């Protein structure tokens, strides 16, 4: 647990790699130091994955269709390319919504052009135009179409932008072409950015000349909450109890009209900085809308965020902010009273995507737990700047961790609990280490807000103290 022990744990693990991979991975592994606050003197990130080392990363299509565009509930998103990508991502992400699926909402459906070799040879542009017509006949209540490009599209010289402009004009329909081919970038991250640029270019400005929306002083947008298990609903509840008017949610349970109304708000509340800082910056420079980062993981961060947000408005909002804080005080205190004793002192290792590896730390600490290791698949150095502030001294940090690295780190550190993804869950269960999914919430949640904290606490307790963990060694082996 001492710095020197972590550093030689790092060196011993990298002894297995060939020369080239050794030197690269050394750059992506660090021990946190309060003397170093810049990250750009400490860890490298957002680089290509070394081949053959079993990265956990996905692709830019995941970051665009899976993450940003897919949740928009009243549009139809075409997975343009062969059949795989759209199928493996069908309904895997629990970006919750209210709608009548197949009629006016389409989130858990898989629309695809199902590329055949003929489409590789001749191109898919003509097929895409026919497909758009077929979507219009069979799904008349769709409010827009997006075209999520899979690997072959760019590779064969297809021009989905022209198709989108031609058919969009013919049908008076918003049709967004997104060049999120999976070979682009190094990870899901570039998919976020491409997706953000597609919103800006083809959707966000549609109402620049309109003035019929009735604004108020308290209009906000939730930016970068994809409503995993209802996360954004359990956040919105608090903001509106505080007197704000949440005009839009990007993009969990989000409608295209919400997107279009966002340039009319007074303040953009950015939860997931990694995936939506791009559009937040755009809206600041163009429409003059300020943005701010917040955190609704656990009562400490939620209280701090509510006050910081209210401080951007007037006395009346600040007073209601304290009314909300006072209302939920007995509730989250009852949660800590029951669950913190059952969790305090336990050590947690996390590995997630671009936000949660830091954003959930305060929630674990609200339950007496300690995060002794964390890392991201695809974060940038500004994420790691924020992570050093949240993570403890001499803790382990890993960027684009390999399957082998994560396994070897766990064996040595022996954390009481691991929080990571589905490709990781079953490895560490077999090792006898309690595991919680920190993408899908293991089909539970919400975890955001005061109501989500109660679920979060309940969930870590039920797994960490489960009777099953005592049973892995047979009584006759010993």
């Amino acid at each position: 647990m001492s710095r020197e022990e972590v550093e030689s744990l790092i060196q011993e693990v990298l002894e297995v790699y060939p020369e080239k991979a050794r030197k690269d991975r050394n750059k992506h592994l660090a021990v946190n130091d309060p003397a170093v606050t810049q990250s750009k003197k400490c860890i490298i990130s957002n680089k290509k994955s070394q081949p053959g080392l079993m990265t956990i990363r996905g692709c830019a299509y995941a970051g665009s269709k899976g993450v940003v565009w897919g949740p928009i509930k009243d549009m139809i998103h075409i997975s343009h390319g062969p059949v795989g990508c759209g199928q493996y991502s069908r309904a895997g992400r629990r970006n919750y919504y209210i709608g009548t699926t197949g009629v006016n909402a389409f989130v858990t459906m898989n629309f695809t052009s199902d590329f055949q070799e003929k489409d590789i040879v001749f191109g898919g542009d003509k097929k895409l135009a026919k497909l758009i017509d077929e979507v219009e006949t069979l799904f008349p209540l769709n409010k827009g179409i997006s075209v999520q490009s899979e690997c072959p599209i760019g590779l064969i010289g297809d021009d989905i932008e022209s198709v989108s402009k031609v058919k969009g004009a013919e049908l008076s329909k918003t049709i967004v072409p997104v060049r999120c081919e999976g070979f682009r970038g190094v990870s899901q991250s570039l998919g976020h950015h491409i997706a953000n640029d597609a919103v800006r270019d083809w959707v966000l400005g549609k109402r620049d000349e309109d003035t019929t929306f009735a604004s108020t002083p308290y209009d906000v947008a939730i930016i970068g909450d994809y409503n995993i298990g209802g996360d954004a609903w359990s956040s919105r509840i608090l903001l509106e109890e505080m007197g704000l008017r949440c005009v839009a949610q990007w993009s969990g349970d989000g409608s295209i009209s919400e997107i279009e109304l966002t340039p009319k708000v007074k303040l953009n509340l950015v939860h997931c900085y990694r995936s939506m800082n791009y559009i937040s910056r755009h809206m600041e420079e163009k429409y003059g809308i300020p943005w701010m980062e917040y955190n609704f993981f656990g009562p400490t961060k939620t209280i701090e965020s509510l006050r910081a947000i209210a401080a951007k408005f007037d006395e009346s909002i600040q007073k209601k902010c304290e009314e909300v804080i006072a209302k939920y005080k007995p509730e989250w205190e009852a949660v800590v009273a029951k669950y913190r004793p059952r969790l305090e002192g336990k050590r947690v290792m996390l590995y997630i995507g671009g936000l949660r590896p830091r954003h959930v730390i305060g929630a674990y600490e609200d339950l007496g737990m300690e995060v002794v290791g964390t890392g991201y698949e695809f974060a940038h150095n500004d994420d790691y700047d924020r992570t050093m502030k949240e993570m403890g001294d001499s803790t382990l940090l890993y960027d684009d961790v390999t399957g082998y690295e994560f396994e070897e780190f766990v064996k040595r550190i022996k954390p009481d609990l691991i929080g990571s993804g589905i490709k990781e869950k079953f490895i560490f269960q077999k090792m006898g280490i309690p595991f919680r999914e920190m993408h899908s919430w293991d089909y539970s949640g919400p975890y955001h807000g005061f109501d989500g904290f109660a679920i979060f606490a309940r969930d870590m307790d039920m797994t960490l103290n489960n009777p099953c963990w005592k049973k892995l060694q047979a009584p006759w082996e010993a």
Partner: protein, 522 residues
Amino acid sequence: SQQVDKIKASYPLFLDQDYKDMLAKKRDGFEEKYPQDKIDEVFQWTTTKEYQELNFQREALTVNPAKACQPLGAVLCALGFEKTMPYVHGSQGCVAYYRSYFNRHFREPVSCVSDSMTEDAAVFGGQQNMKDGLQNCKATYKPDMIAVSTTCMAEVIGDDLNAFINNSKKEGFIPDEFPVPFAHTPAFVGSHVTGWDNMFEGIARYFTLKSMDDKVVGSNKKINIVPGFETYLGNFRVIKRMLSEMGVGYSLLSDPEEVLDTPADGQFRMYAGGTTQEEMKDAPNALNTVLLQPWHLEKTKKFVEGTWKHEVPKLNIPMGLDWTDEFLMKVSEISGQPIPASLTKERGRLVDMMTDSHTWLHGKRFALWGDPDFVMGLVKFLLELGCEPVHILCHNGNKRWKKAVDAILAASPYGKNATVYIGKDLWHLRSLVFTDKPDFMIGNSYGKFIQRDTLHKGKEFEVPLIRIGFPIFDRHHLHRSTTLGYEGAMQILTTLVNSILERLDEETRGMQATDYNHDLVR
């Protein structure tokens, strides 16, 4: 709000009044949602025959497919070999998806690597990715074999796997004797079952093509079994069990049963069991090779017959009573071993269950989908049970396959109202279960959404889903089940009759309305 001693997850938390009012305020204020009467109007339209006709005129758009892409099958094939690492040459997003897809079905670790080809490799090829990838993979994860397939980006730009691997060995990245079979597995051709075929033939050729001269057919007195794309652990286990029971020497070529069911004993085992390299090398010395799923093993058959010189028997998938009978009798003929008393008894117990359950199964109407061999075996068994396979869908089926299923249907009175669909998807099937309502669906977890749609029309219109197939994501441990042989027929029959009885109990549970027929004994 939350009450500490009765915490609510999303369901039913968001049914609280304050959440309900918040959500209504979000819809009315900012969603510009179509009025409910209009949603109701369009929904009813999507249940119509006129909608079905528009639906079946689709040519470019696919909605809710019932198939995946080739590398998924190549991965499952590769996992069936001892200490073998599946290795997909191309872009890494694919491998994240394949692993997660199988992770969710098996609830097990699934090991597979990419060589992370990006924009750079998309113009100058992924030779360097292969060299570093193979060397990195062998050193970090210590496989005895690396089985290589391709994503669609590597196929489009035309990477020559054979040359790339050969150059990796020439230039010292991997030992020359280290085995690295390969197969091209383009996602825009066929489906996931095609990738399994391609991968298996690639492995078979790697170990046998250049060593045939010493081989003698039948010298090892064994029968080769090639299972194909198989996602029920019970199906690997039942085949081995029956052949062991017959005293038939056999080699199961691609056997992932152990790696997909490792114990939770405090240690992670990346590899377990599997077909050995010796078994593949020796496989041409077998008496014959049996293909358990011949309709997606066409390339394998050509190699087995053209190079090993085996006369692959014409056998349907061993599903149901007749085709298990035929499987056992042909193995008996090949091996010279008589069908033992134990299997004869097991057959008669299945027939017994059939006679016990026949009054509840008779005339029951089913829509069903899956891979070609699985579907036609399910059709066959349903006909043997006196059931009517009304809607038969195989998205990845072909004309020759549909012709064979239509011939099976024609031979039975219970096929009179059945139609076989190939190339159609689950949005097509949705229409069919509204316009020509069956009693149940047999299929994978994607069917859950069709059941949801039918209930929205009305409880009397709901078609319940019976989960048999791949993938099953919303129930736990059904991947442990069996569908082949008498054992799997027993399991399927039990699932069907009790799904029927569960539904009847629900429809007769209403006191003083329908519970006159809520019988204790059925």
